[PDB]
Amino acid sequence: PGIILALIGLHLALVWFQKHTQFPGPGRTEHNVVGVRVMPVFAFKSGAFFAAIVG
Amino acid sequence: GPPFIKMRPEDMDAGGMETVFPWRESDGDGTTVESHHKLQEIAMGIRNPVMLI
Amino acid sequence: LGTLVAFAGGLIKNPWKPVVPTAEGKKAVLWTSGWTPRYQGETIYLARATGTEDGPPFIKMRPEDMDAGGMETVFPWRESDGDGTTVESHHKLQEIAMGIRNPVMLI
Amino acid sequence: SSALLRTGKQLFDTSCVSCHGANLQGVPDHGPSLIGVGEAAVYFQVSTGRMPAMRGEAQAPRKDPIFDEAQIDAIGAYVQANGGGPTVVRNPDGSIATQSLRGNDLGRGGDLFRLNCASCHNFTGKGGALSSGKYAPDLAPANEQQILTAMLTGPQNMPKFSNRQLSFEAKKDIIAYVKVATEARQPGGYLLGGFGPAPEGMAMWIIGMVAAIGLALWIGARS
Amino acid sequence: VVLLITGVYLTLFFDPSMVDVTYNGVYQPLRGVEMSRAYQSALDISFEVRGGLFVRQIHHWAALMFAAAIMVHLARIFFTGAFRRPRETNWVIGSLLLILAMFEGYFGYS
Ligand SMILES: CC(C)=CCC/C(C)=C/CC/C(C)=C\CC/C(C)=C/CC/C(C)=C/CC/C(C)=C/CC/C(C)=C/CC/C(C)=C/CC/C(C)=C/CC1=C(C)C(=O)c2ccccc2C1=O
Ligand SMILES: CC(C)=CCC/C(C)=C\CC/C(C)=C\CC/C(C)=C/CC/C(C)=C/CC/C(C)=C\CC/C(C)=C/CC/C(C)=C\CC/C(C)=C/CC1=C(C)C(=O)c2ccccc2C1=O
Ligand code: HEC
Ligand code: HEC
Ligand code: HEM
Helix, strand or coil, rough: CCHHHHHHHHHHHHHCCCCCCCCCCCCCCCCCCCCCCCHHHHHHHHHHHHHHHHH | CCCCCCCCCCCCCCCCEEEECCCCCCCCEEEEEEEEHHHHHHCCCCCCCCECC | CHHHHHHHHHCCCCCCCCCEEEECCCCCCHCCCCCCCCCCCCCCCCCCCCCCCCCEEEEEECCCCCCCCCCCCEECCCCHHHCCCCHHHHHHHHHHCCCCCCCCEEE | CCCCCCCCCCHHHCHHHHHHHCCCCCCCCCCCCCCCCHHHHHHHHCCEEECCCCCCCCCCCCCCCCCCHHHHHHHHHHCCCCCCCCCCEEEECCECCCCCCCCCHHHHHHHHHHHHHHHCCCCCCCCCECCCCCCCCCCCCCCCCHHHHHHHHCCCCCCCCCCCCHHHHHHHHHHHHHHHHHHCCCECEECCCCHHHHHHHHHHHHHHHHHHHHHHHHHHHCC | HHHHHHHHHHHCCCCCCCCCCCCECCHHHHHHCCHHHHHHHHHHHHHHHHHHHHHHHHHHHHHHHHHHHHHHHHHHHHHHHHCCHHHHHHHHHHHHHHHHHHHHHHHCCC
């Protein structure tokens, strides 16, 4: 569990600082990220998903 | 055979002390596993020991 | 190097050191079985398990206690082990019952 | 009226002689001799329905019985009159014992079952597969006398447990353990069949993962 | 996360020994049988702690879901091509995590 926790921390850090990938679409380029900000929306969706999985 | 043996009043002088435990002859000596369990539970009880003065 | 060797040196054991006493000296564990004689001519019975613990967990067998289509598991007895009354014989028997090379099929 | 096995040798002659012979001699093509066998073998083979059998192959399966109205007794007595095989247990009324064949110790019975019986059937008496066709059936619908006669007569490819290597108490205790293991609840929810992790993995993949992926499809947009 | 929480709960009742004892518990069809101390501790969790069977069942189901979700995530990463130039090392870390999860689940249910 300790090794797994360290590796998961490193994994999520690398994903956070190398921004996420995306699918080609209308306004998507290799130089921008199109989505929603964390602030109101993304934390909300993540927490609701957590609760549903626990359920 | 004996981890516990009975006592008589003459087995002590006027300046002696001794620790004693409850015997209950239905416990028997420590030969079988049943009597061995009974005796090992007698030996470990936090209110069993007694000083005889 | 010295530190790592001292760290990983308490775990290492030799699998071939003679520790098991037999009738030709002492052997390694991986070649003795419990069916191995100990003093050159001892009798080892084919005892069977009864599943009860009043006195017998193991009893001897006769050739007539089986028909032409039967199978039975047996264990080495060594009458010097006795029934499971005292703690000493109980330990001996519980070590007979758990040995990875002891069981045998009788056909 | 025990001096009447004229019935018995009225049904055998019209349902068995094509595969065992008129004198119970084992037609050298299909059937065994049936001389050393007794009433217990006939009872187990007919009451469970494995008898009179069609084509006959790696395993005769269990089917619906053909004979009752005390004619299983007729064939059993007729076959016992031609040999000395084991006999079916009886109660003080003359009927076949059901309740007297249940022991009172389930620990010893379960240990004996795990040592002798669980290898082919299961931990708790579900089925098990043998080589090249043959399998070991489920122990749920068999009653007590059928269990006793099964481990007493040693049917096809099942070993034969005499009354000298498995005494009568041992058999009664095994019967009691089997009948209790087939009739106890599952105190953890719906058991997925009695087997190990295969139904559990299937239920995971086909319930939990589809629920999770469906909620992921609902919450998140698709593009 | 759920695995961590339920395992921390479970560690308060488990005794990992291999010494032999006789059961003498509440489960009757096993009374008088000689068993190790770990098996007896697991039986005691199952039958003598209010809500222990529920917790160990949650633990096992969560382990299964952990493994399945890891495999589906790996399938996504592979098929969409999200392992290319900037992210090979993140792929490597994920592979190590997969191996460790497999062996951890094995050691757990043993
Ligand atoms: C995609 C990836 C595997 C490519 C790797 C690239 C490759 C070149 C690297 C080398 C790998 C080597 C050479 C060979 C790999 C083969 C094997 C030895 C690998 C070991 C572990 C491996 C890497 C794990 C990957 C397995 C794979 C990704 C599983 C994903 C399956 C898919 C995507 C699920 C989609 C949704 C799903 C189908 C919902 C429906 C449910 C169905 C029925 C799931 C089927 C199903 C499954 C999958 C069970 O595991 C299972 C287990 C026990 C009982 C039943 C089931 C069962 O029904
Ligand atoms: C301060 C205090 C502790 C001192 C104690 C004082 C002392 C005297 C008392 C002693 C008492 C001791 C013995 C015990 C105290 C504590 C004890 C009771 C704890 C034992 C276990 C206990 C029951 C645990 C309770 C806590 C529990 C209810 C809360 C759990 C909820 C938490 C852990 C959820 C966090 C989730 C996770 C770790 C955060 C990761 C960051 C988030 C999720 C972003 C992740 C994320 C990233 C990073 C992406 O890049 C990304 C990219 C694209 C899509 C998605 C994502 C995405 O989701
Ligand atoms: C040829 C078709 C066939 C018919 C019809 C048939 N049997 Fe059988 N019987 C067999 C075969 C084949 C076996 C071998 C057992 C096996 O392999 O399952 C057998 C086995 C038996 C056995 C057990 C033999 C043993 O050694 O344990 C008995 C008892 C028996 N039959 C009696 C009967 C009775 C009663 C009937 C109903 C009148 C009947 N048979 C009709 C083919 C048949
Ligand atoms: C894998 C070898 C094997 C062993 C060991 C074994 N069985 Fe069987 N058992 C079988 C086979 C094969 C059959 C099917 C015989 C038939 O259909 O004629 C069977 C049939 C039965 C049946 C009939 C099931 C029914 O629904 O009619 C019972 C009851 C039974 N066995 C009980 C036991 C008991 C009790 C033991 C332990 C003493 C045991 N078996 C050990 C293989 C075995
Ligand atoms: C991280 C991945 C983990 C996996 C995949 C995993 C998996 C498992 C599984 C499948 C079991 C079997 C449970 C049962 O059958 O009843 C188990 C048992 C157990 N786990 Fe975990 N586990 C994990 C983490 C942990 C952690 C972090 C802890 C403690 C901090 C823990 C503590 C325990 C304990 C004590 C048991 C034995 C208790 C019992 O069997 O009832 N586990 N594990």
